[PDB]
Amino acid sequence: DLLPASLLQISETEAFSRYVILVDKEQRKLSVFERNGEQIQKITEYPADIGKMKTPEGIYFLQERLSQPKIPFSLYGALAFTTNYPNLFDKRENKTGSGIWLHAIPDSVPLTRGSRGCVVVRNDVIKKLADYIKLGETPILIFDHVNYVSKSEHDKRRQDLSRFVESWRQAWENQDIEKYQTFYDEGFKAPGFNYKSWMSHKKNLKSKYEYIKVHLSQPYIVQHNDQLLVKTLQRYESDKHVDYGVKTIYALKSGDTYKIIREEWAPF
Amino acid sequence: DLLPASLLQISETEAFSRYVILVDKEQRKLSVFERNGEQIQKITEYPADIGKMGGDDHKTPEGIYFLQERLSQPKIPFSLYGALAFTTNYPNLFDKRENKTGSGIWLHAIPDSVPLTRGSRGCVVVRNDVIKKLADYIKLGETPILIFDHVNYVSKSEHDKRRQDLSRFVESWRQAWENQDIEKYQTFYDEGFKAPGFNYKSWMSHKKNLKSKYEYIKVHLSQPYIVQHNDQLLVKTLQRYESDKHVDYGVKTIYALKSGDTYKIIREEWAPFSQQ
Ligand SMILES: [Br-]
Ligand SMILES: [Br-]
Ligand SMILES: [Br-]
Ligand SMILES: [Br-]
Ligand SMILES: [Br-]
Ligand SMILES: [Br-]
Ligand SMILES: [Br-]
Ligand SMILES: [Br-]
Ligand SMILES: [Br-]
Ligand SMILES: [Br-]
Ligand SMILES: [Br-]
Ligand SMILES: [Br-]
Ligand SMILES: [Br-]
Ligand SMILES: [Br-]
Ligand SMILES: [Br-]
Ligand SMILES: [Br-]
Ligand SMILES: [Br-]
Ligand SMILES: [Br-]
Ligand SMILES: [Br-]
């Protein structure tokens, strides 16, 4: 009936993850959602809690799978999955610490006896969750509060953010520098760039390659509190040359809209 | 004839890099070294400098890094980076422990008309012809770049002595672990040790628990990379671990700091390895 307001869309790209794990700390529940075309749908849910031995919230991806004998069953159960904590939003504010894993624990031990901020589930549960996880790809969203909205409200929020992404893509493809610039925060950073050098490079590229095409696959879209994360397979065509890459934008709320603070690209 | 005191050995493991890049800030030189068995051999050398732009002590980071990604146009501007850039893993685990990290470090080029020092603060900058030559030696994710304010060149005799000294340290650690001599093994670790999921106490408790269950283990290490510079020691090896229950192979990286006349491990990483 209802859908999580902060998970708006799962990417259609099959090299990414068709599943997203959503941890609702207030409900003590971990849910698995799957793409259904442009829609999302809940597949399953399990009890979960946060280790207690404020805890972080954020938008993460699962990276590695660990088990015995590398990690002790007494602390982690049969399996642990690491995350990319601290992410770029976390680093922007110098967040560090022991890290965030999704892991299990012995049956005799409460889930809250896990290490602080880790997501802890039962040993039987982690073995089932492993089947949904594509290492390096599957998101894990860890939120204090999850607002559930009607399907019609969810569709509206998704379309609102889809229009934001499209207006950005269009301004980029048009090489309409004046419009494109407005999507970026003056504190923007990317590897090798600040706001000024990023815009200067975009203007210089336009001077060399007048016509470009930018295509974005149906993206992951997550929007929780101030944060917006969009991840897509991007096709860039310019000067009869082409490249495909994984494009991730990180943005923060700015008045009634958002401004991009970080932009990443990796070859695909 | 002389050899850099800080680069003691290159790993024999072909999944890693047989080449190491060494940057000597004082001499404004970048050299390529290649593994020759247990020895190292300098194969080429070019001018290089450190970028000074957009940086009060006026100094730039130094350390023991690995090259990660290769970038070129149209992703990055030629005006700033010339024909190619290679990113690093800066800040590494040593840098994170010191918690005074700055702007990123790349190895890149620049237009022919401008000085190498126009690069951004701390980057290693070379000419366009040079960066294209270096690309032939760089294995992404594997090739070290050692960025040192100063380089101490020593005799081959002195170099081999230092290499053997550190090899004996590593072997002593390996033997203590393999013997599951917990008293001896513990002496190799700093009390502030951390690894993913562990501190000193939980690391030692896990090792003691494994010992209680699996009486005899085997630990084998491929000939390691060994770098020792300033307070830091980095050892990287392909490790085979065997108990009666399982065998695993993985990449083992040890980060250690000087302690009196020896070293204590502050971080220890393992990543699984497979051919198949
Ligand atoms: Br796709
Ligand atoms: Br991928
Ligand atoms: Br619940
Ligand atoms: Br800030
Ligand atoms: Br944490
Ligand atoms: Br159990
Ligand atoms: Br419980
Ligand atoms: Br898995
Ligand atoms: Br499944
Ligand atoms: Br939500
Ligand atoms: Br304009
Ligand atoms: Br960044
Ligand atoms: Br908006
Ligand atoms: Br891009
Ligand atoms: Br030249
Ligand atoms: Br040296
Ligand atoms: Br660590
Ligand atoms: Br942990
Ligand atoms: Br290990």
Numbering used by the authors:
A (entry chain B): 29 to 81, 92 to 306
B (entry chain A): 29 to 83, 89 to 309
Quote what the paper states about this structure.
The structure of mature Bd1075 protein was determined to 1.34 Å. The Bd1075 structure contains two domains: the catalytic LD-CPase domain (aa 47–180) and a C-terminal nuclear transport factor 2 (NTF2)-like domain (aa 196–304). Interestingly, although there was a global agreement in the fold to Csd6 of H. pylori and Pgp2 of C. jejuni which also contain an NTF2 domain and an LD-CPase domain (the junction between the two at residue 188 of Bd1075), there were significant differences in fold elements and local regions. These differences resulted in an inability to solve Bd1075 via molecular replacement, necessitating the use of SAD phasing with co-crystallized halide ions. We were able to trace residues 29–308 with the exception of a presumably flexible region (aa 82–91) which we term the active site ‘lid’. Bd1075 has a consensus active site, with the superfamily conserved catalytic triad consisting of C156, H141, and A142, each present in the expected (presumed active) orientations. The termini of Bd1075 are very different to both Csd6 and Pgp2, replacing the N-terminal dimerization domain of those enzymes with a simple, shorter loop, and extending the C-terminus such that the Bd1075 NTF2 domain finishes with a longer beta-strand (aa 295–306)—residues of which contribute to its binding pocket. Most noteworthy within the core of the Bd1075 C-terminus was the presence of W303, which is clearly located within the substrate-binding pocket of the NTF2 domain. The crystal packing of Bd1075 was such that a two amino acid loop of P107/K108 from one Bd1075 monomer packed into the NTF2 domain of the adjacent monomer. We postulate that its position has been modified in our Bd1075 structure by sidechains contacting the P107/K108 loop and may thus represent a ‘bound’ state.
